[PDB]
Amino acid sequence: RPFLCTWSYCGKRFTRSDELQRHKRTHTGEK
Ligand SMILES: [Zn+2]
Protein backbone atom coordinates (compact mmCIF):
# COMPACT_ATOMS: atom_id res chain seq x y z
CA ARG A 1 0.00 0.00 0.00
CA PRO A 2 2.01 2.99 -1.30
CA PHE A 3 -0.99 5.29 -0.94
CA LEU A 4 -4.21 4.92 1.05
CA CYS A 5 -7.05 7.31 1.90
CA THR A 6 -7.36 5.60 5.31
CA TRP A 7 -10.89 7.00 5.59
CA SER A 8 -13.26 5.07 7.83
CA TYR A 9 -15.43 2.59 5.91
CA CYS A 10 -13.47 3.24 2.74
CA GLY A 11 -9.73 2.70 3.26
CA LYS A 12 -9.00 2.66 -0.45
CA ARG A 13 -5.39 2.12 -1.47
CA PHE A 14 -3.58 3.54 -4.49
CA THR A 15 -0.24 3.19 -6.23
CA ARG A 16 -0.22 6.75 -7.57
CA SER A 17 -0.42 9.98 -5.59
CA ASP A 18 -2.56 11.93 -8.05
CA GLU A 19 -5.17 9.19 -7.82
CA LEU A 20 -5.14 9.33 -4.02
CA GLN A 21 -5.27 13.13 -4.15
CA ARG A 22 -8.20 12.95 -6.54
CA HIS A 23 -9.84 10.32 -4.35
CA LYS A 24 -9.34 12.37 -1.17
CA ARG A 25 -11.40 15.04 -2.90
CA THR A 26 -14.44 12.81 -2.37
CA HIS A 27 -13.88 12.72 1.40
CA THR A 28 -13.28 16.44 1.73
CA GLY A 29 -16.04 17.53 -0.62
CA GLU A 30 -19.59 17.27 0.64
CA LYS A 31 -21.07 20.09 -1.44
ZN1 LIG B 1 -11.57 6.73 0.44
CB atoms within 5 A of ion ligand 1 belong to: 5, 7, 10, 12
Q: What region does 7 belong to: left with phi over 0, alpha with psi -120 to 50, or beta?
A: beta
DSSP labels, 2-18: -EE---TTT--EESSHH
Walk me through the domains of the chain, giving residue ranges and CATH numbers. 1-31 (3.30.160)
Tell me the CA–centroid distance for residue 9 and ligand 1, in Å.
Answer: 8
State how far Cα 24 lies from the chain centre: 4
Tell me the CA–centroid distance for residue 31 and ligand 1, in Å.
Answer: 16
Tell me the CA–centroid distance for residue 2 and ligand 1, in Å.
Answer: 14
- CB contact at 8 A, 8 and 15: no
Q: How far apart are CA 15 and CA 29, in angstroms?
A: 22
